[PDB]
Symmetry: C5
């Protein structure tokens, strides 16, 4: 009868599950070709760590399933959507999307322009799951004491 009391174990378990995820991308900028083997393990570890995190079925994850489906129906399509954009952009270079193909062969230099979106992407998620976790427990923001601005 602890179906609704599962979120508690998902919160403390999400902390580490998210931290390891942020580092994954930090190493994806290189695994893009140098060693994509790690990228394939990290992406499968996140979906395998969550699916196995509810195998006991002793806490009645049923309820936590439906609710998790409303959120899982976008996080997986968006998480692999940004990864492919780059995993396919390398070859899309010929598209000349830029203002000139003068730096075509000079692209291997790796200006690390990929960390410009990932960096702010990890902080946004970490703060999106941290504020949402302490918010849901309130619903009407009774003890939120977070912003209180608006």
């Amino acid at each position: 009868m602890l179906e609704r009391q599962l979120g508690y174990y998902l919160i403390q378990l999400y902390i580490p599950s998210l931290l390891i995820v942020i580092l994954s991308w930090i190493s994806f900028w290189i695994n893009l070709d140098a060693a994509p083997a790690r990228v394939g393990l990290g992406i499968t570890t996140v979906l395998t760590l969550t699916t196995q995190s509810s195998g006991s079925r002793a806490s009645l994850p049923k309820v936590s399933y439906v609710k998790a489906i409303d959120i899982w129906l976008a996080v997986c399509l968006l998480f692999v959507f940004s990864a492919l954009l780059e995993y396919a952009a390398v070859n899309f270079v010929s598209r000349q999307r830029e203002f000139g193909g003068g730096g075509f062969i000079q692209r291997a230099k790796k200006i690390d322009k990929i960390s410009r979106i990932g960096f702010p992407l990890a902080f946004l998620i970490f703060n999106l799951f941290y504020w949402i976790i302490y918010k849901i427990v309130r619903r009407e923001d009774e003890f939120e004491h977070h912003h209180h601005h608006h």
Copy 2:
């Protein structure tokens, strides 16, 4: 009891399962050799996402199995049939199938001629499963209101 009522969950679940599939090929172009590691994960994710999508067996997927077998007995043989054609064409270049082997070493340029079949291949499938889903529910096209041209 809800064996025939499973198609509903397969429809909304197919949307995301198909979208991620289309993007897979878009990257398969470069993954052809640059990083085929991703191509191997995406191809196994589609067959693993469907087989696991009916593990509960609470909706009695039995009926949905037989019907799914009549369609699964071609989609898997055709999906991996086109992928191999290219995965083996790279070395088939020596065959000189073209009108001349003058551009043998100039083939690495990657003219992106592979996106000429994939692009229209994704739209055909997306529209083939979208029109078929809203059609099957009718059988005799009672509320189809799709073409009505005939």
Copy 3:
């Protein structure tokens, strides 16, 4: 109760399982090093497609097991025996097994001499499982009407 009646499902299921296998080798000549990632997935897909094809245990695959063991005790040792011969031959070049090491560095040309054994290897298996399937059902060749020469 349908233990001996399983061969029927194995026949129609072997057709597609064999077709996809033949194509695997056709792409192995290149995956030998260019992208062996696919070769590892195709080889594991055949053994995983059969082992999972009898997970229901509703047709009593028991009987079909002992009989499948007499044949499985050679097809797996021979299937991976020919693959290794080539997967290890590349480095065996130094052996100078040929009539001269003059074409050592000129071996990368890939004369496609590997398709000389694979081609006839796929047709032999396809015809070996097709004639054996329609033969076993007879035992004494009552309605064979295949050769009738001898």
Copy 4:
């Protein structure tokens, strides 16, 4: 009944599980790019060897679970934390973290400066699990007879 008596099987089982882990890093140096395929198997073998080491559930690993959670909530986040630092440092070279980018292209030389942290990292863990195992059984250090210094 033997939930608290599981540590015994975990101790003798940890010896070999730790030894194989130390060797993993020793090879991770070259696997960093030369062949990261092995690094991905060794990292998944440690988490798969432990999770499967308690599948019997005949010794009531329940109790051993909670206690293992207090330690597993850092060993996995720290083990993959150091691996990524290097798996992403290769490309971080452009950061010029050093005192000069003069040896940028001369970095491939592989001075083996990575074995300076791994070596002492394996001995620290081996001695951390060896002294902790013989210590926990005491709690108050009754028969420790290890240091007895201060």
Copy 5:
């Protein structure tokens, strides 16, 4: 119970399991970097072929487990111990363990000096499991008739 009568199925099953293992190393030479993907599948196939060879639990593998543990507690630590030595030796070249680093870049030649230990390593194991299998059944060597020398 046929717990002690399991060794019979393990003997005839070990023959093929060992043969495929010997060939694995023969290819590991080139797979050391050229295509280590196969080496990772062969090493996981041996541990996966044995663990799954006792999934039925109908023959009461319990007894065969304890006895198998006394031998499995060294074969796995020694099998992966020799593989790592080479998988990490490539980078250990800088160690100058040899009598001179004059042939540093001339090491890629691949003198096939690795087959000097593997060859005799496969024959030793094949004869170690063949003589031990026909010996255990005797215990006191009643019908051994193998050596009878001294």
